């Protein structure tokens, strides 16, 4: 029964919730198990980077996050094509490929193409047969220095373009941001109806004319 002032509460405990309680006492054990598998995986694939294949740069969807870039799933076939990397060869040298992803704009495309060219420049490639090097294999002098890389490959960061202070021009002072904003909403709101009214008037005037 309610008693004086308070909040009205609706706990979701009307089922057999005690039959499905998930405790977390195995949490330290999971952390050790996952860590022990990261290490055993890093040893297995050494000297390949422990983090995994290089990932592209992508912009997060929606207006809440489109100011941020993060690691994608894989490089697009257009990005790989522009960088001259065969799509089936890309995975064999630690490049992640995403055939689903599209490139709508050039800047994002060229950002990931430079990424692939920079990664290709840091790639140390061991010959398939150690004793018999081949055309693209790295020289022996840089194979000695090859060491496993920790952390994501070429980590992705959000870098802001610092704009230095500048004298404000009379044209910026005279700009009306709020009036511009309010009129932009109104024009978008009334665009369809205005054209419909305009079209009828043309027909309305034409019928009298002819």
């Amino acid at each position: 029964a309610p008693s004086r002032n308070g909040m009205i509460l609706k706990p979701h405990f009307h089922k057999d919730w005690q039959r499905r309680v998930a405790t977390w006492f195995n949490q330290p054990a999971r952390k050790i198990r996952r860590r022990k598998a990261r290490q055993a995986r890093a040893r297995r694939i050494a000297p390949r980077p422990a983090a995994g294949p290089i990932r592209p740069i992508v912009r997060c969807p929606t207006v809440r996050y489109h100011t941020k870039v993060r690691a994608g799933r894989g490089f697009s076939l257009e990005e790989l094509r522009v960088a001259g990397i065969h799509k089936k060869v890309a995975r064999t040298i630690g490049i992640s490929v995403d055939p689903r992803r599209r490139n709508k704009s050039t800047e994002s495309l060229q950002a990931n193409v430079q990424r692939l060219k920079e990664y290709r420049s840091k790639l140390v490639l061991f010959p398939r047969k150690p004793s018999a090097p081949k055309k693209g294999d790295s020289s022996a002098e840089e194979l000695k220095l090859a060491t496993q890389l920790t952390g994501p490959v070429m980590p992705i960061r959000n870098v802001f373009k610092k704009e230095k202070a500048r004298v404000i021009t009379e044209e910026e002072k005279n700009f009306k941001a709020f009036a511009s904003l309010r009129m932009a909403r109104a024009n978008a709101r009334l665009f369809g109806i205005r054209a419909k009214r305009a079209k009828e008037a043309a027909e309305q005037d034409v019928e009298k004319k002819k």
Partner: protein, 147 residues
Amino acid sequence: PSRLRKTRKLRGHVSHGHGRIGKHRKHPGGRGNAGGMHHHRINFDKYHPGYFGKVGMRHYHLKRNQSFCPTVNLDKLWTLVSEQTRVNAAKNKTGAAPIIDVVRSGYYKVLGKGKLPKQPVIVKAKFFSRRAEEKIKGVGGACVLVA
């Protein structure tokens, strides 16, 4: 801890703090929010006006990312840049104003609560309030709209 609680003090006192007459019974009055329009009506009306009924339009598949618009008032505007940014601009003679990009700080709309220092500034933002634009213009600043 159980040693600091009433039960330890209620040993030997028969009823245990629930009375000899009314006793502690299972669920008098109902369970949960029962009776809201009935024997519990005074409590609900007195403390929860508006609780019963419906108001306004429904919206299916609401996506709260579409209405994302963090706001900042003008009185906190200069905290988005460094302290030396303000003093260097204040004391410089060429008249160059620093650019404050609120979107970089994580805000979209600029609001007008507060008073600005007497110092020109260029403010970039997706949105402005009317009073924010005038206060920014009153100090010799300029509003810049970004997308």
